[PDB]
Ligand binder design. Structure first.
Ligand SMILES: *[C@@H]1O[C@H](CO)[C@@H](O)[C@H](O)[C@H]1NC(C)=O
Ligand SMILES: [NH3+]C[C@H](O)c1ccc(O)c(O)c1
Ligand SMILES: [NH3+]C[C@H](O)c1ccc(O)c(O)c1
Ligand SMILES: [Cl-]
Ligand code: NA
Ligand code: NA
Length: 536
């Protein structure tokens, strides 16, 4: 039961700047509400589906052939996310390489990458840590926008090559490869978080940050942005909507208890996210005190917030080299575990559909890894931060919400929630209670539909700190988002057009499970009765 205790890289990297962007404490209410309402029930649903059917994301829809486009959509979303997930790991490797010294590079203002405006004690970017991150690592000062991105840096190129080589050699021989990664992933982050929290509570000015964190702006609610952000982050962090959970549960024992796993994972997620936010806001308060600025303008709101905040707190400890090495090793391990999970999801989902790919695992693994490396080459250019921001905004947003809603609607309305409950009782010995059935059938779909409609209606053009993207970038992002959403109606049209018979016959074939198709000739379909749809 050590997989349940494993910490996610999302809770440590993405949650801080999403909480800081939305004012602090106002972000916690929609997050908890969505976790209770739609997060845990659908985690449970995906685990149970994968465990019962022993299939991947694509071939699990043999229970309802019309809904097979959702698996392709989630596989495409996983590929899109993996296209930029590994740049964070490359950054962590670069920082770990830079940490092997007694004079950390982010503490002084006397190096070759420092502008004459760098100050050693809108947005504030003249601090040594921010200057290091933006000029000695990204080299962003040589880029003018998404229209001018330049050539990739060779140091980040070497880091990316190392990352992809490790990823390939950790997957080329199959699943269950003696996953010692989860042992580090379940122990070290707790120690690091405890040490950082205990130290940061005592820093001068941290009280203001804690007060800001524990304050709720009720005007920040009633607007769409915080709800959309919380809903997207819940499913991003829990792993739902990527095909990871179904693929991993397809290897579980038949009588494994998915209820306990769902409960434990949800609790760990909540606790880790809250602690991470507390530590981040303590550091923010200290930084605002020391630089003599407001807390709303002291740091950036992008994907590189932790890479500035955490070295700043590390520099305040005694024995900074040891703590820096430990922290960046932990970050690297978290990233590697997440990337392994995503790659395995893609590979298993695609290999279950085509049986020829099962005899050529090494070649298929090489193809997937090389394609990911070639596509990730775009995000290590001089202006790669803009490409990364675009991908992080448009890869798993409305698309992932729509895919999750389609999965829930399919399972709970066309296959049958009572059939699902009977399937669970067959392998676990007990039947799910009324709360789970109600959440599966009515509560979660309604909230997901509302959030999808609101996200479409209230779209805001993309920005990065003080930089405003051109409109064609927004068009490109919306095209990326739609490329995964269009796959479901396309497959429905193809399945209807590729079946021979009459309208009634094709309609009956599209909704009947593949192993019950002998009932079409007998003309007895449960979906053609009122009791099937009235059943709750
Ligand atoms: C520093 O600030 C001045 C404005 O006072 C600006 O003209 C100059 O370009 C800045 N230098 C850099 C590279 O940060
Ligand atoms: N722009 C930062 C965000 O709006 C924010 C962060 C901390 C605060 O105390 C705040 O009022 C707002
Ligand atoms: N385990 C989910 C995580 O967010 C993740 C990481 C890398 C991926 O390629 C992916 O599809 C999912
Ligand atoms: Cl989170
Ligand atoms: Na992890
Ligand atoms: Na989690």
């Amino acid at each position: 039961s050590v997989v349940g205790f494993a910490v996610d890289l999302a809770n440590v990297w993405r949650f801080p700047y999403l909480c800081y962007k939305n004012g602090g404490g106002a972000f916690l209410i929609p997050y908890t509400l969505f976790l209770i309402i739609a997060g845990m029930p659908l985690f449970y649903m995906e685990l149970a589906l994968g465990q019962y059917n022993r299939e991947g994301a694509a071939t699990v829809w043999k229970i309802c052939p019309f809904f097979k486009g959702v698996g392709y959509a989630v596989i495409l979303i996983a590929l899109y996310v993996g296209f930029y997930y590994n740049v964070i790991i490359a950054w962590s490797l670069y920082y770990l390489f830079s940490s092997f010294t007694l004079n950390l590079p982010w503490t002084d203002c006397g190096h070759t990458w420092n502008s004459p405006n760098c100050t050693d004690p809108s947005k504030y970017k003249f601090t040594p840590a921010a200057e290091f991150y933006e000029r000695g690592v990204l080299h962003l000062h040589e880029s003018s926008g998404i229209h001018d991105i330049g050539l990739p840096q060779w140091q980040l190129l070497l880091c990316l090559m190392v990352v992809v080589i490790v990823l390939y050699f950790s997957l080329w021989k199959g699943v269950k490869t003696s996953g010692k990664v989860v042992w580090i992933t379940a122990t070290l982050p707790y120690f690091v978080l405890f040490v950082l929290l205990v130290h940061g509570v005592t820093l001068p000015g941290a009280s203001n940050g804690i007060n800001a964190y524990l304050h709720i702006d009720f005007y920040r609610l009633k607007e769409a942005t915080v709800w959309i952000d919380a809903a997207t982050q819940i499913f991003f962090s829990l792993g739902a909507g990527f095909g990871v959970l179904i693929a991993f549960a397809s290897y579980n024992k038949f009588d494994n208890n998915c209820y306990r796993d769902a409960l434990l994972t949800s609790s760990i997620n909540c606790i880790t996210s809250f602690v991470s936010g507390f530590a981040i806001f303590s550091i923010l308060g200290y930084m605002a005190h020391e630089h003599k600025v407001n807390i709303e303008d002291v740091a950036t709101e992008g994907a590189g917030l932790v890479f500035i905040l955490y070295p700043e707190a590390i520099s305040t400890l005694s024995g900074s080299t040891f703590w820096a090495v430990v922290f960046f090793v932990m970050l690297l391990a978290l990233g590697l575990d997440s990337s392994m999970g995503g790659m395995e999801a893609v590979i298993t989902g695609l290999a279950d559909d085509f049986q020829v790919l099962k005899r050529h695992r090494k070649l298929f693994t090489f193809g997937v890894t090389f394609s990911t490396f070639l596509l990730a080459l775009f995000c290590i250019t001089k202006g790669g931060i803009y490409v990364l921001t675009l991908l992080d905004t448009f890869a798993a947003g409305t698309s992932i919400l729509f895919a999750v809603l389609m999965e829930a609607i399919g399972v709970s309305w066309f296959y049958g929630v009572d059939r699902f409950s009977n399937d669970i009782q067959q392998m676990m010995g007990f039947r799910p209670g009324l709360y789970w059935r109600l959440c599966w059938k009515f509560v979660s779909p309604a909230f997901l539909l509302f959030v999808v409609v609101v996200s479409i209606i209230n779209f805001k053009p993309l920005t990065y700190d003080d930089y405003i993207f051109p409109p064609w970038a927004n068009w490109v992002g919306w095209g990326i988002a739609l490329s995964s959403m269009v796959l479901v109606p396309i497959y429905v049209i193809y399945k209807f057009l590729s079946t021979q018979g009459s309208l009634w016959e094709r309609l009956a074939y599209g909704i009947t499970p593949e192993n019950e198709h002998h009932l079409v000739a007998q003309r007895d379909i449960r979906q053609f009765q009122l009791q099937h749809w009235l059943a709750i």
